[PDB]
């Protein structure tokens, strides 16, 4: 088959770990496959959510032809990402994805194998799901380099999230001050750390920590979303120049998800 993707041993373990903290958050999503890997996109509480699976994270990844997108759900209660669900497949041994055909009529056939067989004779052990690509699909994805980056530890991200506002009547400001003082606050909450360029729990590390800014987040769904994705720690990436500023929070780890929030436009 022209397009083949295999998850076995180590890499299957890696994907399984990537999904653990995510629980059911991405079961209903858009699978965007191409030569770079699988980009899983969603919307949570209205916010843009992405989970990139670099091709290098699979046991085998072979892609040819135009990029292809699939709805993860083959039916209301079943999804192409259900295998990776925490403990739904106890004896899980192998997962294979095969895309056959030609745009816009390619088909995705997902085959699963448990510790009840040997190899991948296909016909043998299994559970299989099939999905037709989308003929037409659109996805707006982030790009470009962030103007500032602040890596935060688990407890640090938690302090921040606890500071962010949760309603239209309580704006939140992310401010990188003169001295490299990073602060997040509302009219009833405040938290601050000391930047410092990455060459003591109040010290956060980042890139271009000299570029000050005072951005405000809209109605701020940050806490709800990140709490839902159970993000441990993460890196805050600020895109300050585009007409609409944006803050992307990428989780710390190997195959971490990212949530992108829009900041109020300035000037």
């Amino acid at each position: 088959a022209p397009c083949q993707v295999v998850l076995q041993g180590a890499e299957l373990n890696g994907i399984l770990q990537a999904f653990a903290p995510l629980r059911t958050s991405l079961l209903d999503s858009l699978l965007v496959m191409g030569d770079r890997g699988i980009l899983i996109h969603n919307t949570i509480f209205g916010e843009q959510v992405f989970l990139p699976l670099e091709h290098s994270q699979f046991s085998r990844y072979r892609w040819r032809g135009p990029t292809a997108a699939f709805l993860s759900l083959v039916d209301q209660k079943r999804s192409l990402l259900s295998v990776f669900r925490a403990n739904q497949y106890p004896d899980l041994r192998r997962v294979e994805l095969a895309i056959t055909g030609q745009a816009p009529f390619r088909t995705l056939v997902q085959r699963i194998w448990t510790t009840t067989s040997d190899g991948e004779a296909v016909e043998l052990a299994s559970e299989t799901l099939m999905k037709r690509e989308l003929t037409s699909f659109v996805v707006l994805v982030p790009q470009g380099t962030p103007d500032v980056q602040l890596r935060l530890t688990r407890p640090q991200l938690t302090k921040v999230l606890n500071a962010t506002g949760a309603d239209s009547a309580t704006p939140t400001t992310f401010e990188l001050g003169v001295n490299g003082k990073f602060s997040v606050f509302t009219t009833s909450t405040c938290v601050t750390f000391a930047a410092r360029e990455e060459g003591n729990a109040k010290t956060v590390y980042g890139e271009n920590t000299h570029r000050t800014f005072s951005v405000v987040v809209d109605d701020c769904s940050m806490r709800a979303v990140l709490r839902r994705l159970q993000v441990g720690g993460g890196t805050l990436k600020f895109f300050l120049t585009t007409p609409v500023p944006s803050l992307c929070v990428t989780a710390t780890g190997p195959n971490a998800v990212s949530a992108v929030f829009l900041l109020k436009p300035q000037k």
């Binding site: 965007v32 191409g34 030569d35 770079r36 890997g37 980009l39 209205g46 843009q48 992405f50 990139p52 670099e54 135009p66 990029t67 997108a69 037409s136 699909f137 659109v138 996805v139 707006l140 994805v141 982030p142 790009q143 470009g144 380099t145 962030p146 990436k237 895109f239 585009t242 007409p243 609409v244 500023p245 944006s246 992307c248 990428t250 990212s258 829009l262 436009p265």
Partner: protein, 36 residues
């Protein structure tokens, strides 16, 4: 929709629909880069 307009004003690149195959192929690579 109002969100697509907001996302476009935020710098988001289009993948699929109104783009050539090489264009969305380039966009996905950029998304993974910035998303990394």
């Amino acid at each position: 929709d109002d969100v697509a307009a907001r996302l476009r004003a935020a710098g988001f690149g289009a993948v699929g629909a109104g783009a050539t195959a090489e264009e969305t192929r380039r966009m996905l690579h950029r998304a993974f880069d910035t998303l990394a």
